[PDB]
Amino acid sequence: IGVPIKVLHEAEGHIVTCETNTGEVYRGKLIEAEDNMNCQMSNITVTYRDGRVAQLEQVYIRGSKIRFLILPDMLKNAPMLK
């Protein structure tokens, strides 16, 4: 296993925001993440492509449809990145 997956496992418990292939932005607390990018998240603010804001409390995103994730800024002092 490489470095970015270990950075993904480090960001669990903090607030991340993910955008997937359907253009939808999901922001909230990351609960679980695996070697593959299957992300279980909770307390989610949801922005669709048109602009509707929704509240979804348990989301499980398949890692295949994910475009990218956005991590907190204090992980630049994490041990695997130094």
């Binding site: 496992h9 480090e10 418990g13 903090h14 204090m74 002092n77 994490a78 041990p79 695997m80």
Partner: protein
């Protein structure tokens, strides 16, 4: 600031404190000498590259006092804050409190369990469950913390006993079963089953850096061979389950007669083979084994001695202590989750208050609520630093705060002060990291509030939070009964000693220093080594003078045995109102039910009376007539009503009772014999002639009158003395057991249990001893058994001293050990002479 080299950045530890889900508050405890501080040393060497153990001596990184270095035992519980990775690789913040395992310093553990959420109990694999382990299971369960158990010193099953593999498995299983029994004895929750299958029990050897659960050793298999689900493979390496090598499956029946269990086949025998090939075969077959396990050593590393080479091989093999982190994350809650029972148990006013729901969320902004339990000295000994945890809010360097003492209420507002915080640190053992703010959930070391703090304190905000109440004081595990008296050698140096006498009062939680009426400064303590450390710290740190200490004595109590021969009546000096009382003893076991809060006040009279009429079989006229109990709020004495409503108007008698209970409180402490507490009495009012005018019903007439009523009822009903009895457990070889029976025979004790330890040749002797006979007891055993027996003593109970304390016909020749009927008289007269009373008290005095 300067700091040692650390494998993680300090800014990462600064930014990790803000998330209260990644923080764990853990207290390591256990019996004496079972491997706590060496495990902390292994964690420190895991986190620091430049700190290494010497080849001949232990490190002891968290023993920072010189008394702990000269005695070799732990005296002060020390905190440390580290960042550790788990098996999956995620970093976690650990606040670890190392507490001493000696029994007389049990107060150092209770101050550690107040500011933490989980308990890790270390148990020696060779000795097993002992006295203080059994007491700390009870004390950690009743304080409502999560409990995990680590079995340290497993190499004593290998290198000392030379024990077969299935017999070592049976020893470990017997230890775990006895732990489950001691859990199930005191708990009402059935979800506290401890087993290695649940990831709840760890295995360790502190001397050679071995630490594993089932999951970490399964991760070792997954890193060695690959393509194995370690979380599923670790579920079948314990209990009666067998590997069948033909089908390559796990079956519950025996394939052959020589089939071993899965824990023996996959885990324990490779450990035996690693230790055997390091110790016995370093010269011939050790490079073959190290080539087989994938471990490369330098040629200079092979030329070491056997113990550092075994530590090096086990450290290269097992590596980081990931199983301990997995156990402390899985089975010890975060302070965001476990805040609600902490506020429910430790905060006065309940969790249902307005501030309790604010503190139950662990909110890092809002009202500042901190609870400081420990006081640490500097190098100079001129000022102290408070140490506690932050329940809510965020404390800042330079913030003006309000310090609340243990006597503060919302009604009084007297025990409070406004102070200014100087600096803030997070504590490592031998250094400290200075920060400017500490959020909620962490531990904090506060400078500049040490002046009103005696034992504990509550740190709040000055403005706002006007309904803030204090937390509960510490409920200690044992009762300090040893009295010593101090004086200065030069009498002009009395204001110097009174400095140090209030300084060691802060660093010691269960210490009680008082001044008698004759001018003696009396210090209470739990044992000999405890007061030895009291004297060392006192003189050498806070007095720098010479101090004389008297001979130690224990604390006595007063009681009755028979029913009083005559009804005891007394009037006020206003000659208007009369109170009459009969004193009787309580039943066996009721006092111990009052003391352990099985029976309580403030109940709404129904369940209270149903207890008395259900268990102890009191009548309805007797169960519905209690007024109050104890001199202290839960003391073992009852004020009972027998006044019939046909003779005494109960609507007018209920007005004076608020003063009669003050009377009974003020008079059940400092009784008439030798000014000590009363035990095991019911004081029963039969007749009362109540005044009609309200000015004659004042407390100033009736409270000394009710005091004299209680004194007369106590003196008429054949009063006796009571002395404390210690419980003693002795670990000894099978030959010196008769010598133990010989030594205990001359100190008025009796042996209750003699039991062999399973899996060990040493025996255990459990006995009761008088506390006044226990001076030099340990030294007598360790001298008479040639140093092979060892003993520890805790406070257990109270019993009646044989003899009559009122027999004036007894003459006592001085400087001679008196026989059994003279004991109560000698104790009573000499304690009156020491405290400063008259030579005698008469029956018709009150």
């Amino acid at each position: 600031q300067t700091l040692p080299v650390t494998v993680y950045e300090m800014d990462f530890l600064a930014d990790l404190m803000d998330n209260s889900e990644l923080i764990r508050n853990v207290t390591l405890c256990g019996h004496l000498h079972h491997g706590k501080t060496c495990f902390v040393d292994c964690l420190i060497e895991q986190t620091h590259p430049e700190i290494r153990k010497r080849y001949d001596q232990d490190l002891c990184y968290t023993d920072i006092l010189f008394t702990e270095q000269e005695r070799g035992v732990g005296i002060k519980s020390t905190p440390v804050t580290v960042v550790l990775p788990d098996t999956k690789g995620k970093s976690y913040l650990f606040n670890i409190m190392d507490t001493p395992g000696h029994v007389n310093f049990s107060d150092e553990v209770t101050a550690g369990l107040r500011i933490s959420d989980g308990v890790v109990l270390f148990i020696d694999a060779a000795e097993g469950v002992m006295l203080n382990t059994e007491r700390l299971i009870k004390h950690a369960v009743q304080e409502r913390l999560a409990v995990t158990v680590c079995i340290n010193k497993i190499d004593r099953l290998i290198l000392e006993l030379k024990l077969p593999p299935t017999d070592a498995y049976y020893k470990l299983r017997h230890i775990v079963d006895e732990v489950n029994g001691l859990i199930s004895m005191y708990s009402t929750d059935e979800n506290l089953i401890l087993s290695p299958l649940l990831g709840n029990v760890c295995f360790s050897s502190s001397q050679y850096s071995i630490c594993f659960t089932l999951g970490s050793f399964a991760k070792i298999y997954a890193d060695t061979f690959g393509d194995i689900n370690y979380q599923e493979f670790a579920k079948r390496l314990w209990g009666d389950i067998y590997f069948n090598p033909k089908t390559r499956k796990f079956t519950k029946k025996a394939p052959t007669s020589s089939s071993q269990r899965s824990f023996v086949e996959f885990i324990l025998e490779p450990l035996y083979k690693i230790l055997a090939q390091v110790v016995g075969d370093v010269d011939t077959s050790l490079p073959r084994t190290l080539d087989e396990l994938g471990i490369h050593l330098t040629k200079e590393e092979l030329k070491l001695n056997i113990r550092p080479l075994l530590r090096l091989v086990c450290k290269k093999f097992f590596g980081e202590f990931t199983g301990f982190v997995d156990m402390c994350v899985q089975h010890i809650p975060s302070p965001k989750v476990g805040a609600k029972p902490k506020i429910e148990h430790t905060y006065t006013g309940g969790v249902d208050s307005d501030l309790g729901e604010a503190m139950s969320d662990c909110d890092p902004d809002g009202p500042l609520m901190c609870h400081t339990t420990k006081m640490y000295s500097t190098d100079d000994g001129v000022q102290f630093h408070a140490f506690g945890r932050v329940l809510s809010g965020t404390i800042h360097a330079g913030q003006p705060v309000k310090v609340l003492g243990e006597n503060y209420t919302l009604e009084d507002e007297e025990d409070s002060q406004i102070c200014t915080v100087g600096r803030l640190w997070i504590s490592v053992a031998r250094y400290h990291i200075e920060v400017n703010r500490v959020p909620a959930g962490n531990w904090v070391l506060i400078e500049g509030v040490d002046q009103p703090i005696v034992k504990t304190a509550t740190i709040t905000e000055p403005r706002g939070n006007e309904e803030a109440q204090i937390f509960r004081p510490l409920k200690f595990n044992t009762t300090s009964v040893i009295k010593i008296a101090v004086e200065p050698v030069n009498p002009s140096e009395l204001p110097k000693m009174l400095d140090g006498l209030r300084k060691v009062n802060k660093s010691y939680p269960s210490l009680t220093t008082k001044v008698e009426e004759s001018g003696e400064h009396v210090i209470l303590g739990t044992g000999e080594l405890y007061l030895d450390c009291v004297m060392h710290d006192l003189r050498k740190m806070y007095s720098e003078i010479d101090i004389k200490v008297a001979d130690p004595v224990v604390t006595f109590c007063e009681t009755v045995v028979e029913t009083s021969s005559l009804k005891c009546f007394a009037e006020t000096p206003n000659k208007k109102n009369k109170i009459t009382m009969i004193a009787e003893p309580l039943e066996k076991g009721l006092a111990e039910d009052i003391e352990n809060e099985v029976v309580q006040i403030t109940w709404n009279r129904k369940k209270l009376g149903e207890f008395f009429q259900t268990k102890y079989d009191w009548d309805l006229l007797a169960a519905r007539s209690i007024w109050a109990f104890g001199p202290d709020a839960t003391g073992p004495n009852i004020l009972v009503d027998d006044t019939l409503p046909s003779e005494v108007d109960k609507a007018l008698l209920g007005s004076v009772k608020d003063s009669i209970v003050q009377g009974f409180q003020w008079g059940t402490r400092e009784g008439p014999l030798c000014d000590e507490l009363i035990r095991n009495v019911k004081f029963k009012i039969l007749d009362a002639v109540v005044a009609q005018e309200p000015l004659h019903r004042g407390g100033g007439q009736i409270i000394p009158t009710a005091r004299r009523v209680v004194y007369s009822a106590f003196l008429m009903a054949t009063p006796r003395l009571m002395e404390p009895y210690y419980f003693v457990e002795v670990q000894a070889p099978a030959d010196c057991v008769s010598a133990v029976y010989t030594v205990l025979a001359r100190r008025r004790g009796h042996v209750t249990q003699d039991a062999p330890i399973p899996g060990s040749p040493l025996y255990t002797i459990k006995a009761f001893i008088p506390a006044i006979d226990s001076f030099g007891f340990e030294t007598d055993l360790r001298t008479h058994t040639q140093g092979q027996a060892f003993s520890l003593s805790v406070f257990h109970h109270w019993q009646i001293v044989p003899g009559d304390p009122l027999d004036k016909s007894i003459v006592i020749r001085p400087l001679e050990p008196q026989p059994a009927p003279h004991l109560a008289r000698e104790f009573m007269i000499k304690t009156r002479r020491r405290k400063g009373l008259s030579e005698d008290v008469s029956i018709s005095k009150f």
